[PDB]
Amino acid sequence: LQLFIKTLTGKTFTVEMEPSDTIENLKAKIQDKEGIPPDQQRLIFAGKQLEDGRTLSDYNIQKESTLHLVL
Template sequence: MPIFVKTPSGKIVKVEVKVLYTLQDVKAIIESFIGCPVADCRMIYAGNELQDCKTLAFYNIEENSTLEVLPSWIQIFIKTWNGKTIMLDVARSNTVREVKDKIFCKVRVPVHFQSIVFSGKRLEDKWRLARYNIEKDSTLHMVLAW
């Protein structure tokens, strides 16, 4: 049966599912459609958060229903070049570039002057935090890149 899914970016995609699919199954299908990890995201239907282990039938989700995918927020810490530590709320699906934008809002260092390091590795702007295994309470280091 077809259902619609509103992604975190606001895009609505139509996917084919079966009523006995779990929400975890649906997330895997959505991920293949949008090319972005949604395993850590929350699924909402009719204002209620859905559990991954339950089926669409359990929630009475019918043909042409619309589910919404929302990021699950985690808290991370950014140690800045001057030793100051700031806290950010991010989604593991955020790109490093999006994190740099959030850092700019807090410390006013332009994005092109920021270099982000985690576990001794410089992070690339285009990749998502999940790719680098950044979890809740991780500490990233922001150094100046001149």
């Protein structure tokens, strides 16, 4: 639901998602939120890059998980 997205520049921001949302939908929210186009977003959870095939649940993403955004 509430996700923390951390950039390498030390900025955190938050987005609200559902676990059935797709990765590409997460990226469209980050674009809405922060202006970063989806093809400049690389999102890492654990040490693994999230792929547009999939849903947040597919990665065991939960309330208050942190994802890294690499631009």
